[PDB]
Design a protein around this ligand. Structure first.
Ligand SMILES: Cc1cccc(NCc2ccccc2)n1
Ligand SMILES: Cc1cccc(NCc2ccccc2)n1
Lengths: 325, 325
């Protein structure tokens, strides 16, 4: 029922965007179908975890608080696609990083996906009292992500910044704000119950879940084979400030750090294997189970504090935590 | 006085953006200075025609309608930099079109410049009643420009679309909306006199001025030498849907069109010269003086119709027209 409604509102949103281009932007049919195919390719095909979280929060604030019900759920679906289209916008920008007309189109597709989140918000929420507060919290989170990738892209340039605190800062702004905090806040906005929750505990829960999500991602990126991971892990080659790297530097010897510096950030097959050898011989995958266990305890505790004043809201955050845990 | 105030508000805006990153985004000083240098490089150095137009419209709606005066002029300066930062955002995206850390930074700079227009609007206009209407008209115009470049980038792919009507559509959405219509509308918003003007005549004036601006630009791109033009004209090589190309195809013979098709869109030095030879021998630069003269007459006439209900507003639009004429 939730997924079936989410994909149904997608067709409704796609129809408005393409008809608006046809009727108000004088677009020919050939380009309308071109943009339909581009929209389906970039937005669909994922797990839609961020978009469905917006709906799961809204439905918990309805029965646990009807013409108001049908509006809030439909509003939660548009917000759910604002994030999915935003996630599509981020993925398209990543493909550009790694008169060529196809490079111009990829850049243009990235800016159309970001603009499409504003057009679907200005239309379906045109007469909602939260349209101004939604756009500002949405734009501030998008700004946050761009600041997050500046820390990530330049974490090796200016191994001084390879610390656990800077790692938290990178994960916090690049990932946690738009993947975990943004859908929860968006569910509270369409439910009109935003000031009914402790945002402090809410923001702290989102940062810890994003940190839990990124550490597990960094370990899989290094040890999970490509056919089981879904991609080719390139964190060691890209010289990324991963959790394995900053945890290794804290427990390595003086020589092992020198052997790490001489082999990290390279594309040679044996230098990468030498980095995995240092990771393996340092028992990092033993520390991984302990680090995440402490994070899960903090999440289990912080959900309870959010429950004394938000019982139903804590149920959806608990469901969102299970998808990450 | 206007330019001296505009550059003074820039320092005020830059200080808030960088301090916000330092205080609320946990940014180190090394990156704060990095972003200050990037902001000065991308935003400053131009003529600031779009940004100063916002101020020229606001000052004409104040005396020709004081604690309200100082606020409207300061609000007009922030809006003037919202467009300049947006123009900087477009220029950065153009440089990308023509683990490389410098390509990631150029992409990130482009998204920071676009996000910075939202942050300076959400702060200096936080308690203004027009913040919601400003962001929506601003985002709709940015969406318009992205649609405008899709028509431009794909005008040779899908010479069928090489028409004077499609040329108008490209110039209208890619250039006219954000260069001419957006500053005028922004001046009316900070002056709170938006519904006091005929938007129909206003929108029609902006499209004709942008069309006047782009035709003169296309002729200079082909015939003005690089040291006198300021760049290297590459419209013929890029196979652009320029005014010269669509006007040439209408008055050329059957063989000359075939000679045009066989030589357009190439980088060879003599094929480009063969295209200029076809342009010269067709007396296009004689048609250029006639086409622009008729456009200028329509602008002179449409300014008068806007004056019967907006005397002071028509003065700033007339001043904006002189900069293009
Ligand atoms: C998949 C994903 C998520 C977050 C960020 C990201 N890339 C960095 C970026 C690109 C464009 C704009 C902002 C940030 N990719
Ligand atoms: C200088 C200038 C003005 C307008 C557009 C433009 N480039 C196309 C583009 C790039 C990025 C986003 C939208 C449109 N360049």
């Amino acid at each position: 029922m939730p997924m079936q409604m989410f994909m149904q509102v997608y067709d409704e949103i796609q129809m408005f965007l393409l008809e608006e281009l046809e009727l108000k932007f004088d677009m020919d049919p050939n380009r309308v179908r071109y943009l339909r195919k581009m929209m389906d390719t970039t937005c669909l095909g994922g797990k839609y975890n961020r978009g469905l979280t917006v709906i799961d929060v809204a439905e918990s604030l309805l029965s646990l608080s009807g013409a108001r019900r049908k509006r809030v759920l439909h509003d939660a679906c548009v917000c759910g696609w604002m994030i999915e289209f935003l996630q599509a916008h981020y993925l398209v920008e990543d493909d550009i990083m790694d008169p060529d007309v196809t490079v111009q189109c990829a850049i243009n597709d990235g800016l159309l996906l970001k603009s499409w989140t504003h057009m679907m918000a200005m239309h379906f929420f045109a007469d909602r009292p939260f349209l101004q507060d939604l756009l500002c919290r949405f734009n501030r989170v998008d700004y946050t992500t761009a600041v997050g990738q500046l820390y990530d892209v330049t974490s090796m340039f200016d191994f001084a910044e390879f610390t656990l605190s800077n790692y938290k800062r990178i994960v916090k702004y690049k990932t946690a704000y738009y993947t975990y905090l943004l859908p929860l806040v968006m569910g509270l906005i369409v439910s009109e119950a935003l000031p009914t929750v402790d945002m402090g505990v809410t923001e702290e829960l989102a940062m810890l879940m994003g940190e839990y999500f990124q550490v597990q991602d960094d370990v899989m990126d290094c040890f999970t084979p490509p056919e089981r991971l879904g991609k080719v892990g390139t964190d060691i080659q890209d010289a990324k400030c991963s959790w394995l790297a900053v945890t290794f530097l804290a427990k390595a010897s003086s020589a092992q750090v020198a052997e790490f510096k001489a082999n990290y950030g390279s594309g040679d097959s044996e230098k990468v294997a030498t980095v995995r050898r240092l990771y393996e011989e340092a028992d990092l995958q033993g520390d991984y189970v302990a680090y995440e266990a402490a994070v899960a305890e903090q999440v289990k505790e912080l959900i309870e504090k959010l429950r004394l004043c938000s019982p139903g809201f804590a149920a959806s955050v608990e469901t969102l935590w299970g998808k990450t845990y």
